[PDB]
Amino acid sequence: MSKGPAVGIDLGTTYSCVGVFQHGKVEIIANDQGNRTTPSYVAFTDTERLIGDAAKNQVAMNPTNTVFDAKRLIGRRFDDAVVQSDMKHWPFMVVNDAGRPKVQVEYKGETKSFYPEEVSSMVLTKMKEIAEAYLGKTVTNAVVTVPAYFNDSQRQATKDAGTIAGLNVLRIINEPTAAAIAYGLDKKVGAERNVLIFDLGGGTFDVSILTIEDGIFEVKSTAGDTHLGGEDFDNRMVNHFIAEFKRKHKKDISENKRAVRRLRTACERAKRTLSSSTQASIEIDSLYEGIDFYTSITRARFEELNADLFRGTLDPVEKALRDAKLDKSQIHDIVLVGGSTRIPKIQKLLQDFFNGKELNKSINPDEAVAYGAAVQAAILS
Amino acid sequence: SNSPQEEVELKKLKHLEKSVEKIADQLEELNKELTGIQQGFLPKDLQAEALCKLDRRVKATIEQFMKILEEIDTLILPENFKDSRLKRKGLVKKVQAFLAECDTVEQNICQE
Ligand SMILES: Nc1ncnc2[nH]cnc12
């Protein structure tokens, strides 16, 4: 295989994305399964090691030896408030090894412990491979992004994750900086630009304020919710259809994991449809106790069910405008990152707050970070 | 009153029917093995080890089946598509009878 170009990688909490700059445009690479984003999952079995889609797929079969959320552990000490808070919701073990956390799995019949960067490296190798498969070229050089709030330890460990993976990590840049680079807000007219990045995706909510002074991005403030994402909107849709099935038939399906699974799955699909259509229909034969569940949900209802959650995304926007010492009217550009920003109510609430100002949503939100990191990789090439 | 549009939804359900058959074959082998261990001449001490060795396969079969149901659950069939709705209901009921046999395998292995 011939030598390839440099790539941009967005190493996310739930999904990672890889892009390459070619023919004067960024191409986001689809994996072996044809997916443009790959799960941040590594599963250990009796016979093999599964990464990405194949790890995500077997989770239900093997929940204890399927690792995800390593990014939440990366660069953190075991005694970190965030580490002890999160391990209570993981089906995998996290152990204290000299103050450093380590996941504890059962791999090929043996008890194996891995540092968070070793997990994150296996994921990175997958990203590297995805690109190597598409281009038919050996990929070594890469630009990996990290959140703006990531400290020195969290940053170095991510670069350590890139190293173990066998990537010549050209640079580590911020996720808000990469999303801004993707829209070329650094190439714009005027002297100082105040950028607000609204990132609702990857099971996290990050509100960043940036200032582009002569092409130098400065992070003025950071706000948000580390446990607010798509899943919360789904939980509300799930509770709605459980209650509805209760008023319809006087039967509780919550105890049945399979009926809840089927309903939650259609609820994820019905939500996506509600971002481009004002109504979504659901037909589930023999859902619970032999009953067929044929129902529908409007965009107006989905909005009502998440009304407090949706409106609440602006508290961080107000909190970030405070800490950056800027009025809303001083914001030159708004950037939409993450899949949940596709929600028309989120776009409208954020547009009305900025007094009808246009939002930057043209670049797929899920790909905006990787798109920016790939532009950066080409520049450093 | 048969529509060409229905033929499209019938082809989807036929392909899903053949996918069920493939997973049903895997279930069939597990059941023959299970029946074989339970009724077989294996040393009693060993029998438990032989039973638990079906865990990974049974759990895979159940997941494959759950995935089949989620592919079926994406179908929107109008009233007039009477044959597709009967074919749809039939397959779900068959995958459910298959899943309830899987639960039986699970109830007979790795017990303590
Ligand atoms: N189309 C979409 N609408 C709403 N939430 C989403 N999350 C990812 N894609 C989405």
Residue numbers in the entry:
A (entry chain A): 1 to 381
B (entry chain B): 150 to 261
What's written in the study?
The difference in affinity between 3 and 2, between adenine and adenosine, and between 8-aminoadenine and 8-aminoadenosine illustrates the importance of the ribose group in nucleotide binding. In addition, we found an intriguing difference between the HSC70-NBD conformations of the adenine/adenosine, 8-aminoadenine/8-aminoadenosine and triciribine fragment/triciribine structural pairs. In the three structures with the ligands without the ribose, the phosphate-binding loop 2, which protrudes from the IIA NBD-subdomain and is one of two phosphate-binding loops characteristic for the actin ATPase family, adopts a distorted β-hairpin conformation similar to that in the nucleotide-free HSC70-NBD/BAG1 structure. In this conformation, the peptide groups between Gly201 and Gly202 and between Gly202 and Gly203 are flipped relative to the nucleotide-bound conformation of phosphate-binding loop 2. By contrast, and to our surprise, in all HSC70-NBD/BAG1 structures bound to carbocycle-containing ligands and small fragments, phosphate-binding loop 2 adopts the distorted conformation also present in the nucleotide-free HSC70-NBD/BAG1.
